[PDB]
Amino acid sequence: MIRRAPTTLQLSHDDVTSLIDDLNEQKLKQQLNIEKT
Amino acid sequence: KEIMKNLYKINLSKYINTEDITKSNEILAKDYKLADNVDVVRSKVDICYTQCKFNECLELCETVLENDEFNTNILPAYIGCLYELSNKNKLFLLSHRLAETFPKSAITWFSVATYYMSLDRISEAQKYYSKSSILDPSFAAAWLGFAHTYALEGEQDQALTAYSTASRFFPGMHLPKLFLGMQFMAMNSLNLAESYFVLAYDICPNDPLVLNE
Amino acid sequence: WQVLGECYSKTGNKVEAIKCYKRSIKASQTVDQNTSIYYRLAQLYEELEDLQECKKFMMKCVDVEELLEGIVTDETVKARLWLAIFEIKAGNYQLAYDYAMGVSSGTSQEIEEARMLARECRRHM
Numbered sequence: 001m002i003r004r005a006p007t008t009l010q011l012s013h014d015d016v017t018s019l020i021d022d023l024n025e026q027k028l029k030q031q032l033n034i035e036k037t
Numbered sequence: 038k039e040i041m042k043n044l045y046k047i048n049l050s051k052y053i054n055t056e057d058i059t060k061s062n063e064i065l066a067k068d069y070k071l072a073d074n075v076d077v078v079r080s081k082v083d084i085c086y087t088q089c090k091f092n093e094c095l096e097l098c099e100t101v102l103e104n105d106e107f108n109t110n111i112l113p114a115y116i117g118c119l120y121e122l123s124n125k126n127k128l129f130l131l132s133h134r135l136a137e138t139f140p141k142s143a144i145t146w147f148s149v150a151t152y153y154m155s156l157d158r159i160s161e162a163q164k165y166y167s168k169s170s171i172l173d174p175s176f177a178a179a180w181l182g183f184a185h186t187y188a189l190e191g192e193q194d195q196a197l198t199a200y201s202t203a204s205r206f207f208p209g210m211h212l213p214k215l216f217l218g219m220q221f222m223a224m225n226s227l228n229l230a231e232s233y234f235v236l237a238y239d240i241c242p243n244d245p246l247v248l249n250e
Numbered sequence: 251w252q253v254l255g256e257c258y259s260k261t262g263n264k265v266e267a268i269k270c271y272k273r274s275i276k277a278s279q280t281v282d283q284n285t286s287i288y289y290r291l292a293q294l295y296e297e298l299e300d301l302q303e304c305k306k307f308m309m310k311c312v313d314v315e316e317l318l319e320g321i322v323t324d325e326t327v328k329a330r331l332w333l334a335i336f337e338i339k340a341g342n343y344q345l346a347y348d349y350a351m352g353v354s355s356g357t358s359q360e361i362e363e364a365r366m367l368a369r370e371c372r373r374h375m
Contacts, residue, residue, distance in 0.1 A: 002151065002182045003121060004216050006249045007223065198354060198365065229372055248351075 040069060045081050050241055051087050052211075058084065075101060075108060082114050089245060094118030107135070112144050115180060128152050128181045143172035147179055154186060162186045163171050178208050181216060193223060219250055251277060252287060264294050282321075285314050289325045301336065308333050312349075327356035334367050343371040 040051070043061045050060060062081065066072040078101045085093035094188050098115045112135075119128045131149035139145050150165035163186050170179035180203040187196035201216035207213055218233035234250060251274035258267035271291045276285055290312035291342045295304035315321050330353035337346035350364035350371070 001178050002154075003115060003117070003246065004181075004185060004188075004219055006246060007219060013175050026101055194365075198361065201354065203353070226369070228375065238306060 039179075040065075044076075048077060049082055051080075055084070060137070079108075079111050079114075082111065086114050086118060088243075091118045091121045095122060106131075107138060109142070109144060109170065112148070116148050117178075120151050120155055123155065125152065125155050128155060141172070143169040143176055143179065146172065147182070150179075150182055150186075152196075154182070154189070159186050159190050161220070163190070168170075177203070177210060177213065180206065181213060184216065188220060188223070193220060197222060197224070211240050213248060215241075215250065222250065255287075256291075259290075259294065264297055264339060267294055268298075282318060285311060285321075285323060286325055288314070289329055292329075305336075315352075322355055324356070327353050327360045331360065331363055331367075334364065334371075338367070338371065343374045347371045347375060 043064055046061050047058065047065070049058075058080065060078060065074070065233055073079060082094050082098045082101075085097065086090075094114060095118055098107060098111055098118070101111065102115065105111075115131075116128070119131075128148070129152055132145065132152050135142075135148055136143040136209040147169040150162045150169060152161075154162040155164060163183070166179055166183040166186055170176060170183055173179065179181055180199075184199035184203055187193075187199050197220060200213060200220050203213040204217050204238050214233050218230040218237065221227070221230035221233070234247070238247050251270060255267045255270040255274065258264075258270055268291070271287050271294075275287055278284055278287075288307050291300065291344075292304045292307040295301075295307065308329060311326060312333060315323070315326045325355055330349045334346045334349040334353075337349065347368060350368040353364050356364075
């Protein structure tokens with residue numbers, strides 16, 4: 001028969017936005033710690 | 038009967054009891070010099086097609102097609118295994134020869150549709166799958182290719198009914214049900230797709246498509 | 251007898267028209283010819299506002315399609331669509347799902363009405 005091209009998962013926008021926000025707060029974490037230290 | 042039983046045994050379905058078909062293949066090959074028979078070769082090609090050993094289709098059915106290029110039984114497997122290999126020149130040559138050989142057969146127009154959809158010209162594949170489906174109603178390949186053209190065109194509402202009607206027309210064939218479940222994935226209704234992936238998996242324990250889906 | 255029922259139906263005598271069609275059903279020699287009467291007979295009950303009573307006649311008109319190896323006629327298409335709609339109100343989504351699929355070979359508006367109904371009952375299935 002004709003094999004149907006298998007579906008491919010896609011990197012969504014929402015999860016990558018979540019990660020970049022998480023990274024932003026991650027770098028914001030020690031910037032005040034450096035000032036504290 | 039000693040040969041007639043094995044010879045009839047060759048032609049059954051290949052999804053279950055696959056090893057026995059292979060033992061019968063060697064049984065025919067030995068003590069009866071029927072290794073050159075076209076039917077044994079076709080059964081071998083279908084064995085390779087099922088486990089998705091596509092290169093083996095290409096080699097074996099090229100060996101036998103040189104001797105006979107218009108064996109209507111053998112051609113659908115060759116078209117499928119060619120499409121999977123994604124080569125357009127050989128398929129173009131075969132389809133264009135078949136069009137001028139058997140104009141009123143559905144096989145040639147199905148081959149033309151496979152060529153166009155290998156070239157990603159879906160609009161013409163629509164018509165050239167419709168013609169093949171009309172020419173032979175009991176040509177499930179044409180129905181599945183038509184629904185594939187619908188899915189690849191961009192719209193899915195009709196392709197939904199396409200895979201539904203394909204499943205209803207051919208009970209006992211797992212592949213249309215699998216494709217229907219894949220479209221259900223495409224439309225994000227997983228509740229139903231669980232059941233059809235289960236019924237498809239009931240008969241196909243080892244193949245990439247089922248496990249991937 | 252069937253013509254008399256139409257005349258009574260068009261003159262606002264629904265009480266009499268019910269007995270008129272019922273007599274016509276008995277006179278029919280073949281069950282197939284009762285497909286047209288069953289659907290119209292069910293509408294009058296809906297006009298009399300007894301939905302439970304019209305269900306029995308709705309069962310018969312759909313069942314003649316199965317007895318006729320899938321006749322798939324127009325006046326059973328409206329039967330399945332109406333039957334599925336009421337079954338949603340009854341809360342039985344599974345019993346309504348098969349009705350939509352069996353009527354997926356009608357007119358352009360018929361198929362989409364059942365297709366959307368199929369998706370709705372499928373989600374709650």
